[PDB]
Amino acid sequence: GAMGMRNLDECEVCRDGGELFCCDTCSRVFHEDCHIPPVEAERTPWNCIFCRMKES
């Protein structure tokens, strides 16, 4: 994108239809890491795990 980085072409899991659990800001930076691990219980795509990672 113009101001967005969706490097999903190198993202095997995106082709599989994998969901992102990161916000725009974190996905553009850690897209590959943001697919790991997908939560198989409460799939909350609006909940950013990388933002929640910076708890301290």
What is the binding site for Zn ion (CB under 5 A)? 8, 11, 14, 23, 26, 48, 50-51
Query: Residue 20: which region, alpha, beta or left (left: phi > 0; alpha: psi -120 to 50)?
Result: beta
Nearer to Zn ion, 44 or 51 (CB): 51
CB 5 → Zn ion: shortest distance, Å? 11
| d(C-alpha 1, C-alpha 7), whole Å | 10
Nearer to Zn ion, 2 or 11 (CB): 11
- Nearest one of 5, 10, 49 to 28, comparing CA atoms: 5
CB 23 → Zn ion: shortest distance, Å? 3
